[PDB]
Ligand binder design. Structure first.
Ligand SMILES: CCCCCCCCCCCCCC
Ligand SMILES: CCCCCCCCCCCCCC
Ligand SMILES: CCCCCCCCCCCCCC
Ligand SMILES: CCCCCCCCCCCCCC
Ligand SMILES: CCCCCCCCCCCCCC
Ligand SMILES: CCCCCCCCCCCC
Ligand SMILES: CCCCCCCCCCCC
Ligand SMILES: CCCCCCCCCCCC
Ligand SMILES: CCCCCCCCCCCC
Ligand SMILES: CCCCCCCCCCCC
Ligand SMILES: CCCCCCCCCCCC
Ligand SMILES: CCCCCCCCCCCC
Ligand SMILES: CCCCCCCCCCCC
Ligand SMILES: CCCCCCCCCCCC
Ligand SMILES: CCCCCCCCCCCC
Ligand SMILES: CCCCCCCCCC
Ligand SMILES: CCCCCCCCCC
Ligand SMILES: CCCCCCCCCC
Ligand SMILES: CCCCCCCCCC
Ligand SMILES: CCCCCCCCCC
Ligand SMILES: CCCCCCCC
Ligand SMILES: CCCCCCCC
Ligand SMILES: CCCCCCCC
Ligand SMILES: CCCCCCCC
Ligand SMILES: CCCCCCCC
Ligand SMILES: CCCCCCCC
Ligand SMILES: CCCCCCCC
Ligand SMILES: CCCCCCCC
Ligand SMILES: CCCCCCCC
Ligand SMILES: CCCCCCCC
Ligand SMILES: CCCCCC
Ligand SMILES: CCCCCC
Ligand SMILES: CCCCCC
Ligand SMILES: CCCCCC
Ligand SMILES: CCCCCC
Lengths: 310, 310, 310, 310, 310
């Protein structure tokens, strides 16, 4: 068998789609191979290295009746665009190949249930067409990976890896597979500032209602604080992804709605007790409401942690 | 006639469009066929199996003057993209074919009137071009179907099937048709949490208004609860599909609007009776309102069930 | 001249664009023609009918130096995609042609001023390239039209027609034109439920304000009902098309805004009369307001009917 | 030099993009030219005029070694789609050419500062490749322009023109340029109904606050009218183009916000004077507020006219 | 080595994408080169300059076995569209080349943390394929740059530059690189009018609450001013870019929310002190609130300046 050295490098992640579950990149694929049948002596005044396009070089190989180690991108989505496809040929028969491209790729491992605390997995598979007794992939050391970013991005890359495996077609011979994989995360700082801090203030305004004496005014104030929560919710709607299943962020907001609505219902009942002449009993229930309100939020937090992270 | 064995497998459902009524996939089409005229003996040192691209192989067939069993995708929409198209040729004349693609498909059976409790039907048709006395489709057993999903999705597949039929063109000979079909559903859990629970609380706040004594304050509170319902409605608008016809979900929300508006009108009339000095009569009508309000919702639920599910 | 029989059938209307004024379809074009110069006798064991692709068949015609009746789609927009293009050739020289496609088409007749009560006209033109003394179109009977729909759609087709005309280029010979045209409408049921019923309730709440005694409370209630109308308006914005000209629906909503705003202004003036000590006069004007409010809506309806439907 | 007669006609304006500054059309390009070297005598039974596709005809010209007057579209954007490209050849050597297309075009002259009272300029440039001593453009009279529209549109065309100029490349010979240009406007009727009338009512409600006696109630009413203005503003947001610079419409709405906010601040100060026991002074300032409020709007209108239209 | 003179000019910036980090243009690439092997004498009556398309000219070079100085666009994104590709050939062997195109380009340097006061960097790289001892780039003086704009735009260009560098592939010979770069900014005038002025008025209304005597009314007014801020926030949402990280504009709006919410909480506590009979102490704390409110905004401004601009 003949050894083929291969590597892949990604310049830039050009987009990520959370609803369709795919991602897009710009990158470069490189292969080194040696074929002694291609060795030559340069003509008088000719340079020491010959250069062809892939279209030009494949004709040369067909005129010599030489087999090319062809390969394919197994999780590609749609059409792929090439910026350049270039070949250098050595005096000794060494072939150096390079192709540079733009493309989209399938991402079947995406899972957003722990949003915004989620970490996602990305990969690209390259497959040999011929079986492993003709051609065997070897890992080109030093080349493969991701380049550095230059401004400010949405996703932060945490880990990068490459390894070699096999695949099979037509129930015959196994063939080589090359894998590049990486992991990435969000800026949690941004969600603290945009969502948590203002919701905590809204929660505080609802608690402060128990500090006043007239139940009539309380009903007005509690009602208005529920409309304020709803108004805020649509103001953040563009930061929430459109998914047909439940997230941690969804559970948090619905639970806040439930507790704030219950404050309206309680103050109506305290007014009813006052109208029936049971002021002292209503005054006693008020004292229990003040202390149990923060305990309800603390026990809800604990519940969400158990259901989503264990 | 000559037997052609065929099968189709879908890796991933890459999108679903409810307004245009189409869907998109990535998959693989496989065909086995035997043609003794293609049998050969391998050259000294040559492998036991020959491999060509479809473009290369069709030239070989034309040089031998052999007919190829050509086929077409009958509900395809737009252009189809190919990732690979590959042929293996056996010593005995057996041809193995494989094509891997991305494409969109028409979906004329979609019907969303029972949303969110709806179940939808999907299919793909593959048609033979030549008539059934030249070539006959046979079902390749073990291959066809859907692969497993790996994270969390919007639609859950409930059933998968394949079968064989016929089609006709130019009022001449019948020709074979191959069908793959499947059924899928939503996560109802998500709609319970996002829509039902908060609407039930809003309905409860409107009922609690009948517990208070001053009709003047009631009018204020009932009015504000109607604006709260409208505000909530636009907060959920992104979860509702843009269709030009009536759904079960539409009927549910309009009915809730009607009943909450009627509470405003009733409390104005009770205030009018008080101003004309008919307090005792107004106090009697109030007692009938308290009990009939929940009965109206229960009888509305029953009505919706009859109109949509029977 | 030589007779060419032609017909067109549409499977599915794949989209309609109200702002750009175009529509999209999937369909099939069929032509029958006879050319005795193409008659043949089948070889020993050959089938009685020969089959070619369009690319293959045109070469045969060029080798025999035979003219093909070429045609073009005159209101096509953009690029057209072909799913299949197929030819059957009879022993007697009869040619049967079929092409199946996806495409978008221009729609210059669209006019939405009577929305939602509007009915729109659609058409497709097919033109012969050669003049009518070489080739003449004849209508293929039984084939042309629209197929049946299978679930639930936005637009309902009301009428379908085909006929033959002529066109002219280079101020020379007239040439044949084939026309398919159809008409379609909306589900008015949907707009009754989504728009009319809730607006009628909002109008009723504004009338009920005249039933109360304290002008001070009336000003509060009338003001809040105007904000409720504005809130509802944005909740329906996605059902309204984005057009740069006036519709019947636009006129209806602006008129409702005018009348509800005038109720706020009137109640402020009644409070001013009370402050200046003219209660009896203010009480008299109130009685005229109660009866004239419904008359204003009835006379507005009559006005809109005259301006838009006559 | 050889005279080339040229003309251009546009059927339909298929879209206009205000943020990207481009427009799209469907149209037809026509050229007449005479070349005696192409004269011929028709064969026995042949028609008097020969017809070719552009691909076919250019081969004929190359076999005779004849130069074709090639041209290019100088402000084209992206790819252009052709529906038909057709050639008629006369017995005397006269060539008649026709191409029919869909395409997008650059629009660098767009300027929206006077919105909605703006009038915009559109153009298309066609350039000769060869210099003017080989080939000279002449204007084909009677053909060029715009066709009639058939329903109801967003933009109304006010003026259409064509003329001839020159261009230069490689600092050598001047070459011909053909220009078609036109001007268009909006329906102002639509903006009167959708924006002006309701804003004028909101302005009137704010003035009516000065007619009441209790400053306490005034503060409530003035505050609520400011929230009503904000609510209305988002209801019209879809009619406003997304531009990164100031328009006349923007200035109008911000000025209305400023004046309505100032009414809230004034009524708080009048309440402060009442609390400090200076009722008579506060009552005097109220009389000045009533008359100066309409004068502020009149002087603002005058200011906007001077800044934008002079 | 052979000198190649190169230059690039951009007509129009056709779009800018802040979320994907790319931009689009229309422009023209020009190259001058001399090759004595191409010198010729013109035939009797032939013009003094020959003209070919790139496809035509490359054939001529292959028939003479002459090497072409090929090049590539190194940060191109997707497919590039050509409007024209043209060659002039001089009697003395001088080649003049021109290509005119539409395309999108990668923009990895974008960084929006200082929005709206940000200034962004753009560039385009052109790379030689052959190494620098065959061909060397030289800068074509007078040609390169940006053209003038004609109406009103979103971005204003502040600086333009070109320079020459090198690049390396296959660890062999260095090759030439040509760079064009430019810088651009926003209209700050627009953001002053749309965001700052109305927020400053909202801030002023919240301060004026401390001028009134009844804490009961203050709580109502402070609550309503918080809902007004939230309503305004969604009215401007379309002017804010959708980025997953914190901007200066984000920090400004969250800080305003915090301070306005704190006014609601303070007035509830002053009412509690009044109910417990500590009016004089509450009256004293009120005097400290009036002066410290503006100081909080001034010190917040200073803090934001330090964190973002130093
Ligand atoms: C960070 C902004 C969103 C906060 C969501 C928190 C809801 C879940 C509470 C339990 C968190 C468990 C620790 C990870
Ligand atoms: C599940 C969230 C939406 C609930 C809609 C229920 C409206 C229909 C009531 C009758 C249901 C009949 C049982 C399927
Ligand atoms: C059907 C929902 C919209 C109703 C619009 C009615 C406004 C026009 C009133 C006059 C109608 C004339 C009869 C067609
Ligand atoms: C027509 C609807 C928008 C009205 C905008 C008017 C603001 C400018 C006032 C001065 C107009 C000057 C006359 C053209
Ligand atoms: C210009 C409209 C937005 C204003 C944002 C100002 C917030 C930052 C305050 C400190 C500015 C420092 C001077 C550049
Ligand atoms: C979180 C809701 C607290 C409600 C406080 C009032 C409780 C009233 C209940 C009366 C029936 C026991
Ligand atoms: C949180 C809502 C509290 C509702 C309490 C209802 C208690 C019902 C008691 C009935 C006694 C007559
Ligand atoms: C669901 C609406 C209940 C209305 C309660 C008040 C009924 C008043 C009707 C007076 C006329 C009979
Ligand atoms: C739900 C609205 C109740 C309206 C009841 C109106 C009854 C009209 C009676 C007229 C008697 C003078
Ligand atoms: C539809 C508006 C009705 C207004 C009712 C009050 C009329 C007051 C007018 C006083 C001046 C004649
Ligand atoms: C619908 C608004 C009614 C306004 C009536 C104004 C009447 C002005 C009369 C002035 C008398 C001093
Ligand atoms: C348009 C704003 C009018 C304000 C009316 C009240 C003026 C009060 C000013 C007191 C200080 C001179
Ligand atoms: C439109 C707002 C009016 C504000 C008037 C303030 C006048 C300050 C005078 C201070 C005197 C103590
Ligand atoms: C910006 C918030 C100002 C709050 C004014 C009232 C302060 C009350 C604090 C009482 C506890 C010290
Ligand atoms: C800005 C909010 C002010 C809250 C002040 C709380 C002070 C707590 C003192 C407790 C004394 C019993
Ligand atoms: C339905 C799950 C209840 C979650 C309560 C939310 C509490 C979160 C505390 C931070
Ligand atoms: C117009 C149909 C009335 C439907 C009433 C809604 C009641 C739903 C109860 C769950
Ligand atoms: C400006 C046209 C006035 C239209 C009034 C609307 C009344 C509609 C009654 C159904
Ligand atoms: C900042 C420019 C002030 C414009 C005032 C608006 C008045 C318009 C009167 C119709
Ligand atoms: C969290 C950063 C606090 C910023 C306060 C905003 C003050 C801006 C003054 C113009
Ligand atoms: C801003 C937080 C104040 C907490 C007050 C607690 C009173 C018991
Ligand atoms: C939260 C549900 C309370 C139900 C109260 C019923 C009173 C009759
Ligand atoms: C009277 C107020 C008591 C506050 C207790 C708070 C316990 C969390
Ligand atoms: C729900 C319609 C009630 C109509 C009341 C009419 C009173 C004059
Ligand atoms: C006085 C309250 C009676 C509650 C009856 C509720 C019947 C559903
Ligand atoms: C509807 C316009 C009324 C104008 C009233 C003017 C009072 C001075
Ligand atoms: C006192 C109420 C009279 C109601 C008259 C209604 C006429 C439409
Ligand atoms: C419109 C600004 C008024 C400032 C008033 C200041 C009072 C101390
Ligand atoms: C007492 C009201 C006077 C109204 C004057 C209006 C001047 C425009
Ligand atoms: C009694 C009002 C005092 C105002 C002081 C303002 C200091 C910024
Ligand atoms: C990832 C865990 C999700 C569980 C939801 C209850
Ligand atoms: C699917 C049943 C719909 C019936 C609507 C009344
Ligand atoms: C279709 C008639 C429209 C007339 C508008 C006044
Ligand atoms: C077109 C004139 C604009 C001037 C803006 C002040
Ligand atoms: C550009 C400086 C950003 C720092 C954010 C704290």
């Amino acid at each position: 068998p003949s050894d083929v050295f291969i590597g892949l490098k990604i310049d830039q992640i050009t987009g990520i789609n959370q609803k369709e579950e795919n991602f897009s990149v710009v990158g470069s694929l490189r292969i080194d191979w040696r074929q002694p049948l291609l060795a030559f002596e340069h003509a008088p005044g000719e340079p020491k290295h010959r250069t062809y396009t892939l279209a030009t070089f494949l004709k040369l190989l067909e005129e010599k009746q030489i087999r090319w180690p062809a390969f394919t991108y197994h999780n590609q989505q749609g059409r792929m665009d090439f910026q350049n496809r270039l070949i250098s040929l050595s005096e000794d028969g060494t072939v150096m190949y390079l192709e540079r491209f733009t493309s989209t790729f399938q991402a079947p491992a995406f899972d957003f249930r722990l949003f915004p605390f989620d970490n996602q997995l990305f990969f690209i598979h390259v497959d040999s067409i011929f079986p492993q007794h003709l051609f065997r992939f070897q890992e080109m050391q030093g080349f493969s990976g991701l380049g550095d970013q230059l401004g400010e991005e949405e996703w932060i890359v945490t880990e990068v890896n490459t390894h070699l495996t096999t695949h099979n077609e037509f129930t015959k011979g196994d063939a080589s597979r090359f894998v590049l994989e990486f992991h990435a995360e969000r800026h949690l700082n941004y969600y603290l500032m945009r969502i948590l801090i203002p919701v905590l203030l809204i929660i505080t305004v609802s608690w402060f209602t128990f500090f006043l004496q007239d139940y009539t005014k309380r009903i007005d104030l509690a009602g208005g604080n529920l409309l304020l929560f709803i108004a805020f919710n649509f103001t953040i709607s563009s930061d929430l992804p459109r998914l047909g299943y439940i997230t941690l962020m969804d559970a948090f907001l619905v639970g806040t709605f439930i507790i704030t609505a219950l404050v309206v219902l309680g103050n109506v009942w305290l007014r009813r007790l006052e109208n029936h002449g049971k002021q002292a009993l209503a005054r006693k229930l008020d004292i229990y409401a003040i202390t149990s309100y923060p305990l309800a939020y603390l026990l809800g937090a604990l519940t969400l942690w158990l259901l989503f992270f264990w």
